Design a protein around this nucleic acid. Structure first.
Ligand code: ARS
Ligand code: ZN
Length: 193
DNA sequence: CACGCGAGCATGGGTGGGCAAGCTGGCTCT
DNA sequence: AGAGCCAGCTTGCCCACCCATGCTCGCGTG
């Protein structure tokens, strides 16, 4: 019945967690990436056990604040009309995946929420993780889109059957100056949090 | 013994200060 | 000689205070 997807961490039986390696900088204190518009934001997928064949990785944005949570996260009308299309991403989608030949962009028939899915691929031998390159195609501040409202990215590991294997999430701010903004927010947390 | 009146209250709204956040300007760098 | 920084600027927006205005309340009246 809910149209709001869960943001609850579920590291699950496979021991699923994310890693993060200026265009992009991660704050572990905030669990929050600070990204520039349309720039690569690499996210690592770590598991303790190997998911089954046909496992998929989905990413979806939701507004972080209770008052906005039920509103679907979409690109603003300016960026939507911008001719920055890679050929596969529908222009209303905020989150894209770059560098994957099997990306699928979904628009939920019931909830109208946008997601982007790629096959899960096990790390190379001797590698601890697999990396997916996401891009956020609007600033947090975009008038008529996010409009300065913080978002969470929800990453789910899903079997081909649709069972939830794992779920992790991190906040995102897409902004002109990620370094400045990370420092500001961390100082605000230490001083007034 | 119902009503009239002046005092004060409640409650949405305005205002000024400060903040947020893309952007510009100069140096520096290569 | 184009480009990268870093500081500072710009500008919508937030926030707290105060105001605005219908209504309540106790007094006194008729
Ligand atoms: As990023
Ligand atoms: Zn936008």
């Amino acid at each position: 019945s809910s149209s709001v997807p869960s943001q609850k961490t579920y590291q699950g039986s496979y021991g699923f967690r994310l890693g993060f390696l200026v265009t992009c900088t991660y704050s572990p204190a905030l669990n929050k990436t600070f990204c520039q518009l349309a720039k690569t934001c690499p996210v690592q997928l770590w598991v303790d056990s190997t998911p089954p064949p046909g496992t998929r990785v989905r990413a979806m944005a939701i507004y972080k604040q209770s008052q906005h949570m039920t509103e679907v996260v979409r690109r603003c009308p300016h960026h939507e009309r911008c001719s920055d299309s890679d050929g596969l991403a529908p222009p209303q989608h905020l989150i894209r995946v770059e560098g994957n030949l099997r990306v699928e962009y979904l628009d939920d028939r019931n909830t109208f929420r946008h997601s982007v899915v790629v096959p899960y691929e096990p790390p190379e031998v001797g590698s601890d993780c697999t990396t997916i390159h996401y891009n956020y195609m609007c600033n947090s501040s975009c008038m008529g889109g996010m409009n300065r409202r913080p978002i969470l990215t929800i990453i789910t590991l899903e079997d081909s059957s649709g069972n939830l294997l794992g779920r992790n999430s991190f906040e995102v701010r897409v902004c002109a100056c990620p370094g400045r903004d990370r420092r500001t927010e961390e100082e605000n947390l230490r001083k007034k949090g």
